[PDB]
């Protein structure tokens, strides 16, 4: 009925703290080819639920993914759910060819079997990815400990008692970045700094604290620290930097020394809505010393544009050939060895203007004769390395985009520029 997967990569989603109100899952595996305005990608999402001890299934459909046209994709189909499950799901594009499936966990997405059961626990989320070459990439994010869904906890109790600042916080590719200048009465060598963040919106309540605890000793300038936010984790975790613009050694009483606190909470979903509230509680301490607890709040808005290029990491390499016999060898991919059941290497000319013409250069372990890829000889030689050989060149700086993948490997992509 459904599709068969090729080169599946499964993840293990681990929730930290509790659920803020959304369900974010990042997928950095799927390939987003560089220098291609004609590279689309169909994506269907299958989600497995557990209502009352009996398994369920929810099929989504996001359609084609135009990389250079739209960032946030809202699903346009639903075959296993409730009344309008297509407003409960967001498919966001981060930088460097990574998506982020977000689902609000305070409103039920499916109800087909029973009506008054609130034991719906999400166990695994599966995402399909249709390649331009026809490859069927898959991802299987499985919950370590599946958390149940508590819906509609009456969240709109927004309140306003915290010193307000005129600056705003921006969230680009789910990543918030704010720079708050503040003043602390203590010096740098006596301050035990500590910060907490809390974002309130329509139904979301995120809480960010620094896992390091209180700052041991505030060194003069650029004090870095990792911060942990409530919800579902992410690589390149949240961070913060308190750079002290104060050459203080023996502080004089009353003088408020200026500090610069820059916060970057990583897992910030879009369901907070525009003009959301972001609280920041900072406080220095010691032997019950100065630096009393303060608070600064500011509006947080979401950037609709992608703050990067969706193209994945690509190693650029030049080939200064002569004549027309230009050759290049593709090394092994990261997580693979000689024992690999299926290995695929694909290539296409830079800036392809046709779909059914340029994407014919595919090579597997049991293949090597491309259907309609001309003047490109692909040989899968020994040493588990591939050998590309381009014929028919000269005085034309053609560029080739090569991409290799294996079973349990991370798909990589090279860019070779044939000059001279």
């Amino acid at each position, epitope marked *: 009925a459904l599709l068969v997967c090729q080169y599946t990569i499964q993840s293990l989603i681990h929730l*930290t*703290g*509790e659920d803020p109100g959304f369900f974010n899952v990042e997928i950095p595996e799927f390939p987003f080819y560089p220098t291609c305005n004609v590279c689309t990608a169909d994506v269907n999402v299958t989600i497995n639920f557990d209502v009352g001890g009996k398994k369920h299934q929810l099929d989504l459909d996001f359609g084609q993914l135009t990389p250079h046209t739209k960032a946030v994709y809202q699903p346009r189909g639903a075959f296993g759910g409730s009344e309008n499950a297509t407003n409960l799901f967001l498919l966001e594009l981060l930088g460097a060819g990574e998506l982020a499936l977000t689902m609000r966990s305070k409103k039920l997405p499916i109800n087909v079997t029973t009506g008054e059961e609130q034991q719906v626990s999400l166990e695994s989320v599966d995402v399909y990815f249709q390649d331009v070459f026809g490859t069927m990439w898959c991802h299987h994010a499985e919950m370590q400990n599946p958390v149940y869904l508590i819906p509609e906890t009456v*969240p709109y*109790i927004k*309140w306003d*008692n*915290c010193n307000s600042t005129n600056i705003t916080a921006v969230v680009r590719a789910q990543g918030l970045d704010v720079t708050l200048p503040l003043s602390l009465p203590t010096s740098a060598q006596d301050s035990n700094f*500590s*910060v*907490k963040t*809390e974002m*309130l919106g329509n139904e979301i*309540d995120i*809480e*960010c*604290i620094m896992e390091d*605890g*209180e700052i041991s000793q505030v060194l003069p300038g650029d004090n870095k620290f990792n911060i*942990t*936010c*409530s919800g579902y984790e992410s690589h390149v975790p949240s961070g913060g930097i308190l750079t002290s613009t104060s050459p203080v050694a023996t502080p004089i009483p009353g003088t408020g020394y200026a500090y610069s606190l820059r916060l970057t909470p990583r897992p910030v979903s879009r369901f907070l809505g525009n003009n959301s509230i972001l*609280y920041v*509680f900072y*406080s220095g301490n*010691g*032997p*019950k010393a100065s630096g*009393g*607890d*303060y*608070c600064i709040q500011s509006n947080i808005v979401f950037s609709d544009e992608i703050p990067a290029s969706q193209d994945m990491p690509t190693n650029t390499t030049d080939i200064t050939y002569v004549g027309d016999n230009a050759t290049y060898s593709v090394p092994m991919v990261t997580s693979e060895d000689a024992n690999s059941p299926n290995v695929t290497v694909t290539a296409f000319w830079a800036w392809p203007n046709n779909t059914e013409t340029d994407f014919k250069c595919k090579w597997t372990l049991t293949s090597g004769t491309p259907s309609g890829c001309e003047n490109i000889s692909g040989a899968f030689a020994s040493n588990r390395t591939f050998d590309i050989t381009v014929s028919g060149l000269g005085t034309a700086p053609k560029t080739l985009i090569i991409t290799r993948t294996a079973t349990n490997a991370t798909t990589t992509t090279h860019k070779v520029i044939f000059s001279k």
Partner: antibody, heavy 123, light 109 residues
Framework: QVQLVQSGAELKTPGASVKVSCKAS????????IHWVRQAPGEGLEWTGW????????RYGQKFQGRVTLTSDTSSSTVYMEVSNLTSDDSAVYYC????????????????WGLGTLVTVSS | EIVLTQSPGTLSLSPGERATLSCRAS???????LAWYQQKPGQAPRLLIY???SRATGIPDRFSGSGSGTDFTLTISRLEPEDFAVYYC?????????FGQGTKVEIKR
């Protein structure tokens, strides 16, 4: 500077209707978590519940089976507690505490403790 | 839900020596989510140790903390008549916050 001024010395009826104030001062009442730890004369401390004064996020112990109601107003830095049910063995000293520092959804250790409020259920 | 069992219960030691109070957890509790408290008769409790080893500001040096996995112990090294209080071990971080049964320490005279 931290102050948890608990209020009340309550002799309450078998059918419960009780409330304790627990004034708070000396810090940002919004940023810290306030817990309530009951102690009956039975050789033990037991945690009842906590509340976030920023979002109103309240959580209660599972032994109570839903008998507690913990609310808070932010205009006056107080956290009101109600344990109104069919109180059989709920004669204990209810302490109002505040976490040592910030924590993600009520996982800070209690560093600041209140005077304590002794309620006694009897007919 | 997690259960904590405090072994000693009552020490009744001399005025000054190491009192090793133990507290065992049923599950593999995180090495930072355990606490220790001191409640003197009539007063309220006060934080003694917060990160399982971290000592709270103001606490004396005699109060040492140890523990990992499920075996956690607090060592009062130098005893004195001002340590008659009852000490508890707490767990925070999961939804049900768990306390200990307590251990009344008595000073000789």
């Amino acid at each position: 500077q931290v102050q948890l001024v608990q209020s009340g010395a309550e002799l309450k009826t078998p059918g419960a209707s009780v409330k304790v104030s627990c004034k708070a001062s000396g810090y940002t009442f919004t940023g810290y978590y306030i817990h309530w730890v009951r102690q009956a004369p039975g050789e033990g401390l037991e945690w009842t519940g906590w509340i976030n004064p920023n979002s109103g996020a309240t959580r209660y112990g599972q032994k109570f089976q839903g008998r507690v109601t913990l609310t808070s107003d932010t205009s006056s830095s107080t956290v009101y507690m109600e344990v109104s049910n069919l109180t059989s063995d709920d004669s204990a000293v209810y302490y109002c505490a505040r976490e040592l520092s910030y924590s993600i959804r009520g996982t800070g250790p209690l560093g600041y403790w209140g005077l304590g409020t002794l309620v006694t259920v009897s007919s | 839900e997690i259960v904590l069992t405090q072994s000693p219960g009552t020490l009744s030691l001399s005025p000054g020596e190491r009192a090793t109070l133990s507290c065992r957890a049923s599950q593999s509790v995180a090495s930072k989510y355990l606490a220790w408290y001191q409640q003197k008769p009539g007063q309220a409790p006060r934080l003694l140790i917060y990160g399982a080893s971290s000592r709270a500001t103001g606490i004396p040096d005699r109060f040492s903390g140890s523990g990992s996995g499920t075996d956690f112990t607090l060592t009062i090294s130098r005893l004195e008549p001002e340590d008659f209080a009852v000490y508890y071990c707490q767990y925070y971080g999961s939804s049900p916050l768990t306390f200990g049964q307590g251990t009344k320490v008595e000073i000789k005279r």
